[PDB]
Design a binder for this molecule. Structure first.
Ligand code: FNR
Ligand code: FNR
Lengths: 223, 223
């Protein structure tokens, strides 16, 4: 595929921040698996995959979220699939989660794990990740935006629209999910929302972005 | 139709955190412009595009960064193309850049810009973005990781290897770039690095991730 360039650019122009989805058109089991897999397979710093993807197909739960998710209301009402992306708190060489990742998932040699912890500690200080709990949590949250971008792009390539959403009352929504047993606020926070479905109509406004020369700069030979 | 699922899946298995690129294989200009466009066309919260992509092809500058970039050393030595992604500081409704984005790029109606500004404030308060300067910066940094994921996936769809990199001494690399007049530390921070090229060999270790059941949960009917 030498036209893969055109294929990719088509998808980045197809994707927009869809508010209104067609309530009749559902994303197939197979397509949504692909979308979910693109989050699961995403890269993450240290390979620590500090995320959870919660598919909220329950209408009454969506409605509860809508009342406190001003920026998500129409997407909650109409999206075929709606995804909460959690980010892990306290992702340190200390945590039981990280020990599980190194020993059980990544398959590190057990005798090296004390030294890897120290290396992790030093990186986190050298990058200011471990300055405070907010920085430590926001670092894991940055990794979930990698998966967020990958999921929307994968959806676009399949002809499926999406919408990322930060427009919700974080404290209130966190409390709703915590009291429902869905969000373990000791291990996670709610990082960002994303919706999937088929548009009801083409976007009435044109995509706007800054000019190439205002966001891109070369230092050295350009070719 | 559904040839595309497997193609997407192939690319997400093709991409890996490449440490050594083939120093004789260069990404084409056409292919790199597609990669760059995937960053420029990435979505961002409020459409504020709070990023800059700086391509460091100067090998002398690469070598200086390398001296304080433990996680990027081989990639700086060998990558065809090496990008620094900057994240903007102080992205609030009062800032000059946001004013530019509202009036010049998004071309909001002048008379109602007060209402736009006021919802920005409310939203940033509701999401704790404006709790402090650290939160404000890291929120913008979160947006750059969308562009990061998109550029790595785009490259992979093109058969091009990539590697994202946080493994550098934040403060020291910031001063180097600042002293050279590449990084204006009052407008930007150095968010993340990303390298592009062609693998020197197939990765020896199989890609590992948590199982689907461990990171994905459905609330409501599945299908
Ligand atoms: C992390 C994040 C969070 C949000 C958004 C984006 C991103 C990346 N944007 C969508 C934003 O307004 C939109 O992407 C851009 O303004 C317009 O560019 P596009 O239409 O996507 O090309 C968004 N849109 C919306 O209707 N409700 C919301 O709560 C949000 N929040
Ligand atoms: C934001 C971010 C930052 C980094 C990374 C990734 C991400 C997403 N990873 C690579 C990371 O270790 C790798 O993606 C996963 O651990 C392994 O899975 P993959 O090979 O990518 O599929 C990485 N790799 C490296 O050689 N030097 C580095 O400084 C970093 N830093």
């Amino acid at each position: 595929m030498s036209n893969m360039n055109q294929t990719i650019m088509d998808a980045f122009h197809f994707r927009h921040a869809t508010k209104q989805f067609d309530p009749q058109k559902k994303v197939s089991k197979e397509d949504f698996e692909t979308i979910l897999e693109s989050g699961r397979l995403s890269p993450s710093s240290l390979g620590l995959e500090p995320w959870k993807f919660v598919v909220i197909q329950d209408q009454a739960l969506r409605d509860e979220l809508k009342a406190h998710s001003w920026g998500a209301a129409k997407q909650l009402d109409t999206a075929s699939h709606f995804v909460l992306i959690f980010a892990r708190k306290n992702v340190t060489s200390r945590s039981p989660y990280v020990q599980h990742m190194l020993r059980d998932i990544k398959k590190y040699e057990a005798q090296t794990i004390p030294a890897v912890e120290q290396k992790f500690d030093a990186f986190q200080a050298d990058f200011h990740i471990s300055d405070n709990d907010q920085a430590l949590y926001d670092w894991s949250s940055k990794q979930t935006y990698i998966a967020l971008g990958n999921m929307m792009t994968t959806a676009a390539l399949l002809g499926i629209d999406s919408c990322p959403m930060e427009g919700f009352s974080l404290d209130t929504v966190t409390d709703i999910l915590a009291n429902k047993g869905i969000l373990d606020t000791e291990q996670f926070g709610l990082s960002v929302m994303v919706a999937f479905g088929y548009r009801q109509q083409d976007p009435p406004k044109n995509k706007t972005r800054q000019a190439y020369e205002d966001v891109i700069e070369w230092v050295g030979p350009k070719e």
